């Protein structure tokens, strides 16, 4: 169960990083790196992830399938979206909500999408 793991992983995790009076979690496909319960990648059984596409342009959307877990090879499906930063946002919007798929990440997923695109465009003067 999720609440079980979280009691093994609250401290004592290979993705937990505690320094400089903050704490953080570098685990895959958790939004905003929060060492948390809501915002955790492994503990749960329905998780939404958003990371840049490996090409340099786009946004890939990890969704855990929940069909069968303890199947890490396939338990875990991705997809790509290369669009115009307004449909891009409204794709993760319609994908999380009106799917009733963890509508906790619903906003944190978008603010991570937007902040991904801001990172792939002309950098500075």
């Amino acid at each position: 169960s999720a609440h079980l793991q979280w009691m093994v992983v609250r401290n004592c995790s290979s993705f937990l990083i505690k320094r400089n009076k903050q704490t953080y979690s570098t685990e895959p496909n958790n939004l905003k790196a929060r060492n948390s319960f809501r915002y955790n990648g492994l503990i749960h059984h329905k998780t939404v992830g958003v990371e840049p596409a490996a090409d340099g342009k786009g946004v890939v959307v990890v969704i855990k399938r929940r069909s069968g877990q303890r199947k890490p090879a396939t338990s875990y499906v991705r997809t790509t979206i290369n669009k115009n930063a307004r449909a891009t946002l409204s794709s993760i919007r319609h994908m999380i909500r009106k799917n009733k798929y963890r509508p906790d990440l619903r906003m944190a997923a978008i603010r991570r999408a937007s902040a991904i695109l801001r990172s792939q465009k002309p950098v500075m003067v």
Binding site: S1, A2, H3, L4
Partner: protein, 52 residues
């Protein structure tokens, strides 16, 4: 050993029992049995009033 059978390779030993079965409480806390018997919440955080 399994649960309802001895070890049969160790002398006398069986798996430990559980202090609780449904180790998840997210489902327990929003089942209709529990939800029905609850005092309604109190979430109107009362900032202290300045006395004029």
């Amino acid at each position: 050993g399994t649960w309802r059978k001895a070890a049969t390779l160790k002398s006398n030993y069986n798996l430990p029992m559980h202090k609780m079965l449904n180790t998840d409480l997210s489902r327990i806390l929003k089942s209709p049995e529990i939800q029905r018997a609850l005092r309604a919440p109190r979430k109107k955080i009362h900032r202290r009033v300045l006395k004029k």
